[PDB]
Amino acid sequence: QDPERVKMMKFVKLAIVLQMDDEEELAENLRGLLNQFQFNRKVLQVFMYSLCRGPSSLNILSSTIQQKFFLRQLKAFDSCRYNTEVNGQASITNKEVYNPNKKSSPYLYYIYAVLLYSSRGFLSALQY
C-alpha cells in the first residue's frame, strides 16, 4: 500500500534474481521496472549493467520481444519530443519530461542500437 515501499521492493527483488541463472525471471523483473520508471536514465543503466555477461544476457537482448518493447518506448519519447501521435507508441506515463531543445534521449537510441547489433542487424545498428 506504500508507493515508496513498492519501488524499493522491486529493486531488492531484482538484486536477488541477478544471482540465479533464471533468464525468464530476470527478463520479467526488468520489463516491470521499465514499464514503471519510463524513460528513466538510472533504470536504463541498471537494465544494461544487469545484462553485462554471458549467453543468458545476450538471449534477453537478442529476443524479438525486447526489440519491440524498446521500439515502443522510443516512439513514446519522440511523441513527448514533438507533441504528435506516433503509431504504436507506449502510453506516456512519465509526463514530467522537460526537453525544450527537442534532443534525442541518447540512452534510448543507444539501447536500441545495441538490441539490433546483438541480433546481427548491422545495417540497422549503424543508422541509430
Place this chain on the structure above:
DNA sequence: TCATATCACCTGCGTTTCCGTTAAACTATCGGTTGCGGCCATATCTACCAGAAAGCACCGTTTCCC
C-alpha cells in the same frame, strides 16, 4: 348399648395411584450480524498474423571459352 355375619343399594367423603404443573441444566438447530471475494468494466500491452516493396535464389539461353 357395643362386639360379628350377609345383602340389596346410591350417594357421599376423601381417599389413594400415574399424569401434569412450575421451572431446572443441558440440548438442537438456525438467525441478526460480523468479515470476506466473484463477474465484468476500462485503458493499456501484447501474441499471432498477412501484405508490400524489395531480396535472392533456382535456372538455362546465350556465346565465349575447354
